[PDB]
C-alpha cells in the first residue's frame, strides 16, 4: 500500500503516509523493553536512552527498535508492503547512511527506500527550490542555504544549541527561583512550560526593564500534583539563549548571526535570493515572536539594499515531514526509489507547482504524555 515518510529527530519521531498533510503519529525518540510513548509513561521504573543525539544516530540496536515501534506499534502495517522515505541530518556520515539502508532492506524488508536531507524537505514544503533554511529541533540547529534544489555544503552551519538546551536553561533559571525541579521526569514538565508560556522578546532589554514592575508578564501553570506556579520573565529569558548563547556558557553565535554568517559564505549574486527566502522549520522555531525578532535582527545586519523576507508557517514544526510527503508523491520521484534488488547488486518545476491543499487532512496523534506525581516521586527515590 502507500509510501511511508519517517522523519527521525533527536527528541521526536514523526511518521506517516506520503500524500497526507501531517504526520500520523509523533512520539518521543527514546528507549528504556519499551520504546517512545510507552517508555515515557513507565520512566518511573526505567532507564531511558536517546539513540539519536544531535540528529546523528549513535545506537543502531535502539534505532532499530524505534523503527520497529513505528511500523508495528504505531502505524500498524507490514513494513515489507510499503516503500519508506527517511530523513537524515546534513553531513550525515556515509557509514550511518549505509547502516540505515542495511537495516531497512535486510531487517524490515522494505520494497523501496530513499533518504533525504531534512532542511531540503522544509524548503520543498514551502514550495521552493532555492532558499536558506533555519532548522532548529531538540538536539541540534542547522543553517542550510540551498540553490536549485542542491545544498551548498561549504556554507551549511551547525550549532549544538537547541530545544534541549533551552529546556535545561529554563529549568536552571526556575531552580534559582526556588522550584525543586531535580529529576529527568520533572525536566519534561519544564519542557511543557517552555512550549506553552515561553516566547521571544522583540527588544530584550526594554522588555526586561518593563517586566520588573508589571503583572502582565506573569502566567500560571498547573503542575502534576496540583500546585500552581507562576512564570514571569523566565518566559522570554530562556529563549534569549538562542540569540545570545553566552548566557549558556557556549561561545556560539546566536541563530541570527549564524544565519548571516551562512549567507556571507555564499556568492554575492546568490545572497539576494537567500535573504528573501529564509525558511524557519523545527519545533524550536515555534516560539511566539521568534520570526519578528529574526526579521529585525537580520535586517539590521544585512545590506540596506536587500529585503529580508522570512517564511515561518504555522505548521513549521512538521515542515521536514511535509516535505517528505510532497516529495514522495511526485511522479518524477518514483524513478528515484532504491529497490530491494538494486541493493542486492550494489523535477525542479514540480516543487514550485505542487498544490498542498490536495494533501489529505490528517489528525496528528501526538503521544508524549507528561509524568504523574507518582512517577516523579518514583524517580525521586534514586
Ligand atoms: N510551541 C513550541 N514552542 C517552543 N518549543 C517547542 C514548541 N514545540 C516544540 N518545541 C520544542 O521543539 C523541540 C522538538 O522539535 P523537533 O521535533 O523539530 O526536533 P527533532 O527533530 O525532534 O530534533 P532534532 O532536529 O534535534 O533531531 C523540542 O525541544 C520541543 O520542546
Ligand atoms: Ca529535526
Coordinates of C-alpha atoms and ligand atoms in Angstrom, one line a residue:
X1 CA 0.0 0.0 0.0
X2 CA 1.0 3.7 0.2
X3 CA 4.6 5.1 0.6
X4 CA 5.6 6.0 4.2
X5 CA 7.5 9.0 5.4
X6 CA 9.6 8.7 8.5
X7 CA 11.4 11.7 10.0
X8 CA 13.6 10.7 12.9
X9 CA 14.6 13.5 15.2
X10 CA 16.8 13.9 18.3
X11 CA 13.8 14.2 20.5
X12 CA 10.8 13.3 18.4
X13 CA 10.0 10.6 15.8
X14 CA 7.5 11.7 13.1
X15 CA 5.9 9.1 10.9
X16 CA 3.1 8.9 8.4
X17 CA 1.9 8.4 4.8
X18 CA 3.0 10.1 1.7
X19 CA 0.2 12.3 0.4
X20 CA -1.2 13.1 3.9
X21 CA -0.8 16.7 5.1
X22 CA 0.7 15.9 8.5
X23 CA 2.4 13.1 10.4
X24 CA 0.1 10.3 11.5
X25 CA 1.9 9.7 14.8
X26 CA 4.5 11.7 16.7
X27 CA 6.2 10.1 19.7
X28 CA 9.4 10.6 21.7
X29 CA 12.6 9.2 20.1
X30 CA 13.5 7.1 23.2
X31 CA 14.1 3.6 24.5
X32 CA 14.1 2.3 28.1
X33 CA 11.7 -3.4 26.6
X34 CA 9.7 -0.3 25.8
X35 CA 10.0 2.5 23.1
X36 CA 8.9 6.0 22.8
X37 CA 5.5 6.9 24.3
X38 CA 5.2 3.6 26.3
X39 CA 8.7 4.0 27.7
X40 CA 7.8 7.6 28.5
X41 CA 4.9 6.6 30.7
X42 CA 7.0 3.9 32.5
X43 CA 10.1 6.0 33.1
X44 CA 9.4 5.6 36.8
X45 CA 10.9 2.1 36.7
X46 CA 13.0 2.6 33.6
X47 CA 16.3 4.0 32.4
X48 CA 15.9 5.9 29.2
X49 CA 18.3 6.3 26.3
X50 CA 18.0 8.6 23.2
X51 CA 19.6 6.8 20.2
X52 CA 19.8 9.9 18.1
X53 CA 21.9 12.7 19.7
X54 CA 22.3 16.0 17.7
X55 CA 20.4 14.4 14.9
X56 CA 23.0 11.7 14.2
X57 CA 22.3 8.0 15.1
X58 CA 24.5 6.7 17.9
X59 CA 22.9 3.4 18.7
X60 CA 21.6 1.1 15.9
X61 CA 20.1 -1.5 18.3
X62 CA 18.0 1.2 19.9
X63 CA 17.3 2.9 16.5
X64 CA 16.1 -0.4 15.1
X65 CA 13.5 -0.7 18.0
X66 CA 12.0 2.7 17.3
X67 CA 11.5 1.8 13.6
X68 CA 10.0 -1.5 14.8
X69 CA 7.7 0.6 17.1
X70 CA 6.8 2.8 14.1
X71 CA 5.9 0.0 11.8
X72 CA 4.2 -2.5 14.1
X73 CA 3.0 -0.5 17.1
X74 CA 2.2 3.0 15.8
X75 CA 1.4 2.8 12.1
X76 CA 0.4 -0.9 12.3
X77 CA 1.4 -2.2 8.9
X78 CA 3.7 -4.7 7.3
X79 CA 7.0 -2.8 6.5
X80 CA 7.6 -5.1 3.6
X81 CA 4.5 -3.7 1.8
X82 CA 5.4 -0.1 1.9
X83 CA 8.2 1.9 0.4
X84 CA 9.9 4.1 3.1
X85 CA 11.3 7.6 2.8
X86 CA 13.6 8.6 5.6
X87 CA 15.3 11.8 6.6
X88 CA 18.9 12.4 7.7
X89 CA 20.8 15.3 9.2
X90 CA 23.1 17.2 6.9
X91 CA 26.7 16.0 6.8
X92 CA 25.4 12.5 8.0
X93 CA 28.5 10.2 7.8
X94 CA 28.3 7.6 5.0
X95 CA 28.8 4.8 7.5
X96 CA 25.4 5.8 9.0
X97 CA 23.6 6.3 5.7
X98 CA 24.8 2.8 4.8
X99 CA 23.7 1.3 8.1
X100 CA 20.3 2.9 7.7
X101 CA 19.9 1.3 4.3
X102 CA 21.0 -2.1 5.5
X103 CA 18.5 -2.3 8.3
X104 CA 15.7 -1.0 6.1
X105 CA 16.3 -3.6 3.4
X106 CA 17.7 -6.5 5.4
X107 CA 15.8 -6.2 8.7
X108 CA 12.4 -4.9 7.7
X109 CA 12.4 -6.0 4.0
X110 CA 11.2 -2.7 2.6
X111 CA 10.2 -2.8 -1.1
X112 CA 11.7 0.5 -1.8
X113 CA 13.8 3.0 0.1
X114 CA 15.1 6.6 -0.1
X115 CA 16.8 9.1 2.2
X116 CA 16.6 13.0 2.0
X117 CA 18.3 15.9 3.8
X118 CA 15.8 17.4 6.3
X119 CA 16.3 21.1 5.6
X120 CA 15.8 20.4 1.9
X121 CA 12.4 18.9 2.5
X122 CA 11.4 22.0 4.5
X123 CA 12.4 24.1 1.5
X124 CA 10.2 21.9 -0.6
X125 CA 7.3 22.0 1.8
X126 CA 7.4 25.8 1.5
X127 CA 7.2 25.4 -2.3
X128 CA 10.7 26.5 -3.1
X129 CA 14.0 25.0 -4.5
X130 CA 16.2 28.0 -3.6
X131 CA 16.2 29.4 0.0
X132 CA 18.1 29.4 3.3
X133 CA 16.6 27.1 6.0
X134 CA 16.9 27.5 9.7
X135 CA 16.1 24.1 11.2
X136 CA 16.1 24.1 14.9
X137 CA 15.0 21.0 16.8
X138 CA 15.5 19.4 20.2
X139 CA 19.2 18.4 19.9
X140 CA 20.6 20.4 17.0
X141 CA 20.2 23.6 15.0
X142 CA 21.2 23.9 11.3
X143 CA 21.5 26.7 8.8
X144 CA 21.4 25.3 5.3
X145 CA 21.5 27.5 2.2
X146 CA 20.1 25.8 -0.9
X147 CA 20.1 26.7 -4.6
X148 CA 18.1 25.0 -7.3
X149 CA 17.4 22.0 -5.0
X150 CA 21.0 21.5 -4.0
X151 CA 22.6 22.3 -0.7
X152 CA 25.8 24.4 -0.8
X153 CA 27.8 22.2 1.6
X154 CA 30.6 24.7 2.2
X155 CA 28.0 27.1 3.8
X156 CA 26.0 24.7 5.9
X157 CA 26.3 25.7 9.5
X158 CA 25.6 23.8 12.7
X159 CA 25.2 24.9 16.3
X160 CA 24.7 22.4 19.1
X161 CA 22.2 24.9 20.6
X162 CA 18.6 23.8 20.6
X163 CA 15.4 22.8 22.4
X164 CA 17.3 20.6 24.9
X165 CA 19.5 23.5 25.9
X166 CA 16.5 25.9 26.2
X167 CA 14.7 23.3 28.4
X168 CA 17.8 22.8 30.7
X169 CA 18.2 26.5 30.8
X170 CA 14.6 27.2 31.7
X171 CA 14.9 24.5 34.4
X172 CA 18.0 26.2 35.6
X173 CA 16.5 29.7 36.0
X174 CA 13.4 28.1 37.6
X175 CA 15.6 26.3 40.1
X176 CA 17.3 29.6 41.0
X177 CA 13.8 31.0 41.8
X178 CA 13.2 28.2 44.3
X179 CA 11.3 25.5 42.4
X180 CA 12.6 22.0 43.2
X181 CA 12.9 20.6 39.6
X182 CA 15.6 18.0 40.1
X183 CA 14.7 14.8 38.2
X184 CA 14.5 13.8 34.5
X185 CA 10.7 13.5 34.9
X186 CA 10.4 17.0 36.2
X187 CA 12.5 18.1 33.3
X188 CA 9.6 17.1 31.0
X189 CA 7.3 19.4 32.9
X190 CA 9.7 22.2 32.3
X191 CA 9.8 21.3 28.5
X192 CA 6.0 21.7 28.5
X193 CA 6.2 25.0 30.4
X194 CA 8.7 26.2 27.8
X195 CA 6.4 25.2 24.9
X196 CA 3.4 26.8 26.4
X197 CA 4.5 30.0 28.1
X198 CA 7.8 31.0 26.7
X199 CA 8.3 33.5 23.9
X200 CA 11.0 35.6 22.2
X201 CA 11.2 39.3 23.1
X202 CA 11.4 41.8 20.2
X203 CA 13.6 44.0 22.3
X204 CA 15.1 42.1 25.2
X205 CA 16.4 44.9 27.4
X206 CA 13.3 47.1 27.0
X207 CA 11.1 44.2 27.9
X208 CA 13.3 43.1 30.7
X209 CA 13.1 46.6 32.3
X210 CA 9.3 46.5 31.9
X211 CA 9.0 43.1 33.4
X212 CA 10.3 44.2 36.9
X213 CA 7.1 46.2 37.6
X214 CA 4.4 44.7 35.5
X215 CA 1.8 42.0 36.2
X216 CA 1.0 41.4 32.6
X217 CA 4.3 39.3 32.2
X218 CA 3.1 36.7 34.8
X219 CA 1.5 33.5 33.8
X220 CA 0.2 30.4 35.8
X221 CA 1.0 26.8 35.1
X222 CA -0.5 23.7 36.8
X223 CA 1.9 21.0 38.0
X224 CA 1.0 17.3 38.0
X225 CA 0.4 17.2 41.8
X226 CA -1.9 20.2 41.5
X227 CA 0.3 23.0 42.8
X228 CA 0.1 26.1 40.6
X229 CA 3.3 28.0 39.9
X230 CA 3.7 31.4 38.3
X231 CA 6.2 32.1 35.5
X232 CA 7.5 35.7 35.0
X233 CA 10.3 37.0 32.8
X234 CA 11.7 33.5 32.6
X235 CA 9.2 33.3 29.7
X236 CA 11.4 35.4 27.5
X237 CA 14.7 34.9 29.3
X238 CA 15.1 31.2 28.4
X239 CA 14.6 31.7 24.6
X240 CA 17.0 34.6 24.6
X241 CA 19.7 32.0 24.8
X242 CA 19.1 31.3 21.0
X243 CA 20.3 34.8 20.2
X244 CA 23.0 35.3 23.0
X245 CA 24.3 31.7 23.7
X246 CA 26.8 33.2 26.1
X247 CA 24.2 33.0 28.9
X248 CA 24.6 29.2 28.4
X249 CA 28.4 29.4 28.6
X250 CA 28.5 28.5 25.0
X251 CA 30.8 30.6 22.8
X252 CA 28.5 30.0 19.9
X253 CA 27.0 32.8 17.8
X254 CA 23.2 33.3 18.0
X255 CA 20.7 32.0 15.5
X256 CA 20.5 35.5 14.0
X257 CA 24.3 35.9 13.5
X258 CA 24.7 32.2 12.3
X259 CA 22.1 32.8 9.6
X260 CA 24.0 35.9 8.5
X261 CA 27.4 34.1 8.7
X262 CA 25.9 31.4 6.5
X263 CA 24.7 33.6 3.7
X264 CA 28.0 35.5 3.7
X265 CA 29.7 32.2 2.9
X266 CA 27.7 32.3 -0.3
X267 CA 28.4 34.1 -3.7
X268 CA 27.3 37.7 -3.7
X269 CA 24.9 37.2 -6.7
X270 CA 23.0 34.5 -4.7
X271 CA 22.7 36.2 -1.4
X272 CA 19.8 38.4 -2.5
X273 CA 17.8 35.3 -3.3
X274 CA 18.7 33.6 0.1
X275 CA 17.7 36.8 2.1
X276 CA 14.2 37.0 0.6
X277 CA 13.8 33.2 1.0
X278 CA 14.5 32.4 4.6
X279 CA 12.6 29.5 5.9
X280 CA 12.3 28.5 9.5
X281 CA 11.4 24.9 10.5
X282 CA 11.6 22.7 13.5
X283 CA 9.9 22.9 16.9
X284 CA 12.3 25.3 18.5
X285 CA 11.3 27.9 15.8
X286 CA 7.7 27.8 17.2
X287 CA 8.2 30.4 20.0
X288 CA 5.8 33.3 19.6
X289 CA 7.8 36.3 18.4
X290 CA 10.8 34.5 17.0
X291 CA 10.1 35.4 13.4
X292 CA 9.7 39.1 14.0
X293 CA 12.9 39.1 16.0
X294 CA 14.7 37.1 13.3
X295 CA 13.3 39.7 10.8
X296 CA 14.6 42.7 12.9
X297 CA 18.0 41.2 13.7
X298 CA 18.7 40.2 10.2
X299 CA 17.5 43.5 8.7
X300 CA 19.9 45.4 11.0
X301 CA 22.8 43.2 9.8
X302 CA 22.0 42.9 6.1
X303 CA 22.9 45.4 3.4
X304 CA 20.1 48.1 3.4
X305 CA 19.7 47.2 -0.3
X306 CA 18.5 43.6 0.2
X307 CA 15.0 43.0 1.6
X308 CA 14.6 40.3 4.2
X309 CA 11.5 38.1 3.9
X310 CA 11.1 35.2 6.3
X311 CA 8.8 32.2 5.9
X312 CA 7.5 30.8 9.1
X313 CA 4.3 28.9 8.5
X314 CA 2.0 27.7 11.4
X315 CA 2.9 24.1 10.6
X316 CA 6.7 24.6 10.5
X317 CA 7.2 22.2 13.4
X318 CA 6.4 19.4 10.9
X319 CA 7.8 21.0 7.7
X320 CA 10.5 18.4 7.2
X321 CA 7.9 15.7 7.4
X322 CA 5.5 17.6 5.0
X323 CA 8.4 18.0 2.6
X324 CA 8.8 14.2 2.5
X325 CA 5.1 13.6 1.9
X326 CA 5.2 16.0 -1.1
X327 CA 8.5 14.7 -2.4
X328 CA 7.4 11.0 -2.2
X329 CA 4.2 11.9 -4.1
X330 CA 5.9 13.4 -7.1
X331 CA 5.7 11.5 -10.4
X332 CA 9.3 12.2 -11.2
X333 CA 10.3 10.9 -7.8
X334 CA 9.1 7.3 -8.4
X335 CA 12.1 6.8 -10.7
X336 CA 14.3 7.7 -7.7
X337 CA 13.5 4.9 -5.2
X338 CA 16.1 2.3 -4.4
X339 CA 14.7 -1.2 -5.0
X340 CA 15.3 -4.3 -2.9
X341 CA 17.1 -5.7 -6.0
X342 CA 19.1 -2.6 -6.7
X343 CA 20.6 -3.1 -3.2
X344 CA 21.2 -6.8 -3.8
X345 CA 23.5 -5.8 -6.7
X346 CA 25.3 -2.8 -5.3
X347 CA 11.6 17.8 -11.2
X348 CA 12.6 21.3 -10.0
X349 CA 9.4 22.7 -11.6
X350 CA 7.1 20.1 -9.8
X351 CA 8.0 21.5 -6.4
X352 CA 7.0 25.1 -7.4
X353 CA 3.7 23.8 -8.9
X354 CA 2.7 21.3 -6.1
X355 CA -0.7 22.1 -4.5
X356 CA -0.5 21.4 -0.8
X357 CA -4.3 21.8 -0.4
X358 CA -4.7 18.5 -2.2
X359 CA -2.8 16.7 0.6
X360 CA -5.2 14.6 2.8
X361 CA -6.4 16.1 6.1
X362 CA -4.7 14.3 8.9
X363 CA -5.1 14.5 12.6
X364 CA -1.6 14.0 14.1
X365 CA -1.6 11.8 17.2
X366 CA 1.0 13.4 19.5
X367 CA 1.8 10.7 22.0
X368 CA 4.2 12.2 24.6
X369 CA 2.3 12.1 27.9
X370 CA 3.5 14.1 31.0
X371 CA 4.7 12.2 34.1
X372 CA 2.4 11.7 37.1
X373 CA 3.3 12.9 40.5
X374 CA 3.7 9.2 41.3
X375 CA 6.3 8.8 38.6
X376 CA 8.1 11.9 39.6
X377 CA 8.2 10.6 43.2
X378 CA 9.2 7.1 41.9
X379 CA 12.2 8.8 40.2
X380 CA 12.9 10.9 43.2
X381 CA 13.7 7.7 45.1
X382 CA 17.1 7.2 43.3
Ligands
LIG1 N1 5.5 25.6 20.5 C1 6.7 25.4 20.9 N2 7.5 26.4 21.4 C2 8.7 26.2 21.8 N3 9.4 25.0 21.7 C3 8.8 23.9 21.1 C4 7.4 24.1 20.7 N4 7.0 22.9 20.2 C5 8.1 22.0 20.3 N5 9.1 22.7 20.9 C6 10.4 22.1 21.1 O1 11.0 21.6 19.9 C7 11.8 20.5 20.0 C8 11.4 19.4 19.1 O2 11.4 19.9 17.8 P1 11.6 18.9 16.5 O3 10.7 17.7 16.6 O4 11.6 19.8 15.3 O5 13.1 18.4 16.7 P2 13.6 16.9 16.5 O6 13.6 16.5 15.0 O7 12.9 16.0 17.4 O8 15.1 17.1 17.0 P3 16.5 17.3 16.1 O9 16.2 18.3 14.9 O10 17.4 17.9 17.1 O11 16.8 15.9 15.7 C9 11.7 20.2 21.5 O12 12.8 20.8 22.1 C10 10.4 20.8 22.0 O13 10.4 21.1 23.4
LIG2 CA1 14.7 17.6 13.2

